[PDB]
Every structure is written in structure tokens, then in C-alpha cells.
């Protein structure tokens, strides 16, 4: 079908193009990402020369947030069936899912009534190889296009995936570690180094990635805890 | 606007201040008055103006005063030279130091 | 009981001090608010004298995030039995709960064991009368101190309260309204104006504050949508 | 005369309110402060002044935005004051100062302007003991040929006042490796100036206990390098 | 000659690689760039230069100033610090808050020669295969100057010349026009505009004429004509 692809790293992110390319293998793609990296607000976009010619799809860099992209995207390529967001250069596991821009664009998609999926790959130290991840991405996008729609998933792919795995969000407890220190200039400060009490437990997104498995976690919008209500 | 005012009679000529004073009636005034093209040394000295428009006495020619005037005060929108005690009409225009200073101003773009 | 108080508007907001004073009616209060990540990061903190005319409050202004304040406070003051955060200028209802700094600091309190709550008040237009709201913060805190510990609640107080209510988050579908427009210069741009399909239901936090009731919503940490797992 | 007071720390900074109360000793005072090149929208909400009532507005925008709205809503305005910023704005810091940019915007709009700052980290500025010197400073600027653009740094406990030039220093880029409490490596960037601030500079003046006042320029061109390059025979 | 290359658009900006490529033609190039005030900690991870030859590179999770200090410690000593090519102009009043310019200035403050490179944007994107000739010519000029130097460079999209320039300094009018969004809420339109056109010899003027603009910058913001 028609698929809007965005992200929050910007129009020059290798991960954005890997996901659009990987998407175009299941439908017509349309890109709208922030070139910049909740009440009527001005937003402008500019046609952008996409680096993908197999096949070539219309792109736009937007001077706005990832959510602006989704919106401007749907008005520019409407109607659209699926909103993809990623691939984020960095993980979005556990507590991270809360303030995740990547996840936020996908979420904004769902509220507009489409299906959505955030993709992320851990980083820090070494850079991902979207060339080798393409298999797993495709295999991953098949699995999602099967699901009862609408849906909202959060995908995390390890650097070298050896499998898939529907997962649950890791919800650990932390102790707030704080150690006094002093920069080279003798100035005092405190190291705030939070660390979890236990390890990720099987079935959790964080565990899946540690095992080398692509993690895909369905998400809920209502943060309300109906039990204590 | 801003104005640079000079003359070729010196910093004590009543003509110069009679000009600076009339000049201030239209913008910020700065006065630089006297005491070749190859690089030459020039010294200016803070001078108390008798209103009050910042001023300098320049151990140099009038041209020097316009050059220095702009570098120590400028930018500036206009150059005024005078009032010269003595006329500058007809054939006289050729060798007037009063006119030569305004000329140095035009050649500088003002 | 000891109580830690903070916010995200900064050590100078008068809402930080109204909550702190309301807290003091139930135990010893300590403040750590911003002067204005998970990896170990340095945090500066300086003693800050409380308000000139009111009970004396041990406080600290910190060069870090609200979450950092929760951590530094616990280290500099705590043991603490409750973490309060607010009173935030501006509201934190429905969708907003995710990308809210106020909720965030509370949330961090929870992840540490301790019980915690966040207070917000609608701004834009007329400023809140913290003297007129005192009776309601006191009223609200009385109710939360009855809940079994640990707990995590989001509270929104209208400007002129006339009741209380335990709500659930107001979830709604939106439409990407995108009106084309032009500014004076003559420059073209798109007005993105997101708008909900139907007014907030009832028993929702957004609905209550609209009626004039204080709203309080217990929250969950787990974003997983179990039913699809 | 009428004065617009803004800052870049927010409408709740006590330095903002100290500047406005001090500006009121010399004229009608209006306030427009920040919430936190091309035509953009700016929301401005009336804010009640927590002292002699000051019409105030809380702006959802940049300080430069405040100056522009402040001139529209309160015009005419003859002077634009920015601060008092909790934190100094000396030497190389002038370049990036939000406080300074607000004043610079006023100058660019034709008005006279000045930025005020005080040092932080440790003792909080005592604005009562600073009121006298804040007043003195304002009285002096008000005796300068207008318009003027000035940068003011007041020490915690002023003993005087001085016209200063900006401190300009070279540095040695010190990079010191280290590891956090949990093992992860990083680099401690901490540049140290190759020499002490020379007297006559803003930094020096504040270290000696004097209010520092530096007249700023708008032109960043290095004409002593440009002019020769542009010359012909 | 050893040249450190950085920018503020990110390790992924083509502008950054266009410049490192052009700089290699004059010496050994090293790259250190941002990922996205006092003693602070900074992280930095190796990064493979895109495939063009290989450039030792690093992505720094800090500011362009951090990149410059981090590049001099990781590849020092360095002779020149080049920052850009920025995707957007840096002319006139804009020079003041330029991140690109900030990086170069940092290198200067460290005793090194520096220059910032910017190409005007907001419409179409630059063609760095066509800009390369003009970049090379520009670097060649810069490297003949007396050291150290601090220069700001702006290149139009498709250049037909080169001019040493001065900064355009202009006065403005605080255009504020009342209005409401098609929804009903009110707001104020702020549209500052110059009281005049850029003058001949200023950077803004040069670029609008199709010329590359090179402005030597001063570090001192002091107005001595109001001090004395």
C-alpha cells in the first residue's frame, strides 16, 4: 500500500533511508523527515532529492518535529496506510520508550488512525550495518503487515539478529547511585549513575536484544492504571 | 545620521566650531582638525570641544583628518570642511585645502 | 515522614513553593529544583535559601534535569517517603503525560521505590492563585496519603476548583488538519492544527478539569499492550 | 522616558524584577520576558508583576522576540535593558550571551540598550545590596550620547564603576581522559587561559570589585586584515 | 600540513564530507564532528568516513567547540581548523550565533588558523560536485594568507567569482503584525526587515552577486570609539 516513512535523526540519517528502502519492498513509500534533527503552528517542507532510485520515492525535509512530518506527510501523500519511524541510531528499550522521538512519530501515526512501527538499533561504539540488517528488517515488516490493524509496535533490532521475538517492555527498578567528584579544576560535583537492581528477565524487549533477537513490542496508549482506579 | 567635521585652519578656528555646531543640528558630530599617498605616520590627540561634540587635533593635513576621522570615529555618512575664513571661488577652487578635504571624503565614498 | 519536592519550572517558580508549603503540613520538606539520560553524568548542586517570609525550607538548586533533582535530593536529604513534583505551571493531561517533565520527576521517584505524585495547573491566560488553591492541595495530599505505598499519581487542579475526582487518562483520536497559509512577507507554509475527533469522555482527567473538578490519575510504568502478546 | 525590560532566564528570575524596579527610578517601565530571521508567530500572555506595578507580558519566544513585541505593545520605548542575568557575561562569553543578544536587538531597532549580569555558583546575588550600584550604573548610561550598546557585569559586592574593553585571551585546549563511576570512558574538556586578564578588561574590573561597562560594536570585520587585502597600486 | 575538519550539522552532513575531501587536496585531513561552557565531560566514538578515500573520523557527543578541542587532542598537532560546509548561510548579523563560526573561532583561540564555510539554503540543496572547484580555489587563497587567520566564507550555490568582504551591518524595523490562526487563537507576527539593501563590499552583497565571500573576523567585540 502507501507508506509514510519518517524518523527523528534527520533527512541525512542512513537509518532513515534503510527503512524506506526496506519498506518500498511492500508498497509505495513517501518520505517526510526533519531536516532539523500542540496548537496550530506554522510548518514548512521542501522537496528533497532522495538517494534511493530502486525505486525512487518523493521525499521532503521538514522544518519541524517528527510529529509535524507525519501530519504534513498524510496531507501531502494522503491517504496513507502505514506510518514507519526509524531506523533510529540508538536503542529505545525499557524506560526509554517514554520520551522517545522515534516512538513518538509512530504514536502520532496511530492517533491519526494508521498502523505504526518504530524501529531502532542499539549503537554506542560501533555503527550498524543496514546492508546486513536488510534481511531481518524485511522479515520483520512481513510479520507486522500480517497483524490485525490498526497496530502499534516498537521494534528493536540487535546489530546482528539471529531471530525474531514478540516482546514485552522491560520494567525494572533502579537505585539512584550518587558519588561526589571534582573535575580537573578542583570543582566538586556529583556523579548520578543510576543502575537497575536486577537483570532483564526473559520475554522483555531488553532481554530479547541481549540474546540477539529482534524485539517487537505492541504498545498501549492509555497510561491509566485501571487497577488502582 | 553621523557627520565628520574638519577644516584647514586648525582646531581653534571659530569657523570650524561654527560649522560643527550647525552640523550637530542634524546628527551626531565628531570633529577632527589639523595642527602624499605612501603610508605615513599620523598622530591624533583627544581634544575638548567647547553643546559637546567629541573632537581630535590631528598632527596632520586635512585629508589625514578625514582618514583618521573615520577610523577613530566612523563609520560616518557625511564630511564637512570649514567654515574657511577666506573665500574659495573660481580659479581658487583648484588649490583649496578646504575643498581638498571634502574631496578626500568623496573619494572615500561619502 | 520526610518529603522531597521539585518541579521543572525551576527553583524560582511560585508553584514549587506552594506545593512545598502544602507538603510541610504533613512532615519535613526538602527542596531540590533545577537552577534552570542513563549514563553516569556529573551534576552540580548549590544551597539555595527558601522564601523570605514563610516556614524555612532546606533547599538546593541543581544544574541538571528534574530526574537529577530527585536523585541528588535523595542523596543530600533522603531517606524520603514521598516525592512531590510541581506545582507545574501549565497542565499535563491526556496525551501530554508522556512528554511531561513534571510527571517525569515523579516517575523517577517511583523507580527508586519511594511513592510519588505530580501536580499541574492550567496556565495560559490567568495565573493561578496559590493562596486560593492551598485548601485543595492540602485536600489532595490528604487523599494520596491514604493510598497504599508505593503509588504514582498525576494530579491536575483547575484554577478555581469545586470538587475532586479519580480519573483515568483521556485518550482520543486526532485528525491531521493542515491548512495552507502565507505570512506577511508572502512566504508559504502549512498550518498544522491537530484536533480531536470527539470531546473527552467522562471520568477522564481532561473532562474533570473541564467541569471544575481536581483530577488525579494513578499511573503505570509498563507501556506493553499485553492483549496482543 | 519609557523603558522595556527583558532577560533570558525567565519571567521569574529575581534579576529580571530587580532590573525593572531599578529602571523605574528613571522612567515608565514595561516588561516582556521569555517563556523559558524569518517571519514567525509569537504568543504573548499578560503577566502580573509580583513593588510598583509593572505592565508585564510573558512571551512564548526568544528574548529578541520580546524586544520586538515589547516595542509594539509598549511603544514608544527609548531604552532596552536586558538582565540581570544570573551568571556573568565576560570576555569570549559576550559572543554567545542570550542577555547581550536581547540588548543588541534593541540597538538594531534604533534604541539605546544595555545588558546586565552578575556571577553565580555559590552565593546568590544579593539584590538589595546591589540596588545602589544598579541605580548608579543606569544613571551613568543615561548620560551617554544615544544610542549606545553596553555590556554590564556587576560584581557580587561592587566598590566602583569602570568603562572596560572586552578581555581577549588565547587558550591551551586541555583534554583530560577519565572514566565514569561505572567504567565508561570520556574526555574532560577544560581549556585554560594562557594568561591573567589584563587591567582595563571587563574580567579584571569585576575581579577587582568594580561594575564593568563595555561598549560593544556590531561589526565583526577585521579591517586591519581586510583593508590591506582590498588595496591596489 | 595537518587539517582538522568539523562542522555543526552533524557527522552525516554531506557539506562536512565535501569539505574534508577538498581539504585533503592540501594536507592530511582529520574529521571530528557533533553527533546531533566550563570543565565538562564529553564522549567520542570512532566513525567510518563514507565511501571517496578514507578519513580518520570521530563523532563527538558534544559541541563543535568540543569537537575542535577533541580533534586537537586526538590528531594533534594541527595547522588548520576548517568548519563546514554549513547547510545554510552565515552572513551579517547571523555570524554572531553561528555554530559553524563558533568552531572555527575555537580553533583560533587555540593559536591555529581557522575558517568557516557556509552555502546559502532554504529552497534547493547544494551541489558539491560543482562547488568543489570553487572550494579548492578558496582554500588555496586562504592558505597563502599570513598565519594565523580567522576567516568566514560563504559560497553561493553556483559561484562566478570571489571577493574579500566586510560584514554587512544593517539596521532593522521591528515589524509586528497582529493575527489569528485559522482556528481562532490570536498571536503576533514578528517579521524583522532591514532598513536598506546590503552595500557593495559586504558579504551579503557579494553572495547575492554570485561571488564567494571571504570575511576576516576580529575576536574583540569592544567598540574602542566609545571607550577612550
UniProtKB/Swiss-Prot annotation, chain A:
Q: Does the keyword Transcription apply?
A: no
| Primary subcellular site in the record, as a coarse category | cytoplasm
Please write the reaction equations for the catalytic activity of this protein: a ribonucleoside 5'-phosphate + H2O = a ribonucleoside + phosphate
Q: What's the name of its gene?
A: surE
What NCBIfam families does the record point to? surE
List, separated by semicolons, the cofactors it needs. Answer: a divalent metal cation
Name of the protein: 5'-nucleotidase SurE
Q: Does the keyword Transferase apply?
A: no
Query: The organism sits in which domain of life?
Result: Bacteria
Q: Which InterPro entries match?
A: SurE, SurE-like_Pase/nucleotidase, SurE-like_sf
The residues that hold a divalent metal cation are 8-9, 88
Role description: Nucleotidase that shows phosphatase activity on nucleoside 5'-monophosphates.
One GO location term (cellular component): cytoplasm
Family per record? Belongs to the SurE nucleotidase family.
Q: Which EC main class describes this enzyme?
A: hydrolase
From which organism does this entry originate?
Thermus thermophilus (strain ATCC 27634 / DSM 579 / HB8)
Q: How is the cofactor bound?
A: Binds 1 divalent metal cation per subunit.
Pfam families assigned: SurE
Localization of this protein = Cytoplasm
Keywords from the UniProt entry = Cytoplasm, Hydrolase, Metal-binding, Nucleotide-binding, Plasmid
EC number in record: 3.1.3.5
Single Gene Ontology MF annotation: 3'-nucleotidase activity
Swiss-Prot record, chain D:
Per the UniProt entry, the Enzyme Commission number(s) are: 3.1.3.5
Q: Which cofactor does it need?
A: a divalent metal cation
Membership in a protein family: Belongs to the SurE nucleotidase family.
**Compartment(s):** Cytoplasm
Q: What is this protein called?
A: 5'-nucleotidase SurE
* Record: residues binding a divalent metal cation: 8-9, 85
Q: Give the cofactor note text.
A: Binds 1 divalent metal cation per subunit.
Q: Which species does the entry assign this protein to?
A: Thermus thermophilus (strain ATCC 27634 / DSM 579 / HB8)
- Is this entry keyworded Metal-binding? yes
Q: Which Pfam families match?
A: SurE
Q: What class of enzyme is it?
A: hydrolase
The job of this chain, per UniProt, is described as: Nucleotidase that shows phosphatase activity on nucleoside 5'-monophosphates.
HAMAP family given in the database record: SurE
User: Reaction(s) catalyzed by this protein?
Assistant: a ribonucleoside 5'-phosphate + H2O = a ribonucleoside + phosphate
In which broad location class does this protein mainly occur, judging by the first location in its UniProt entry? cytoplasm
Q: Which SUPFAM superfamilies match?
A: SurE-like
Gene behind the chain: surE
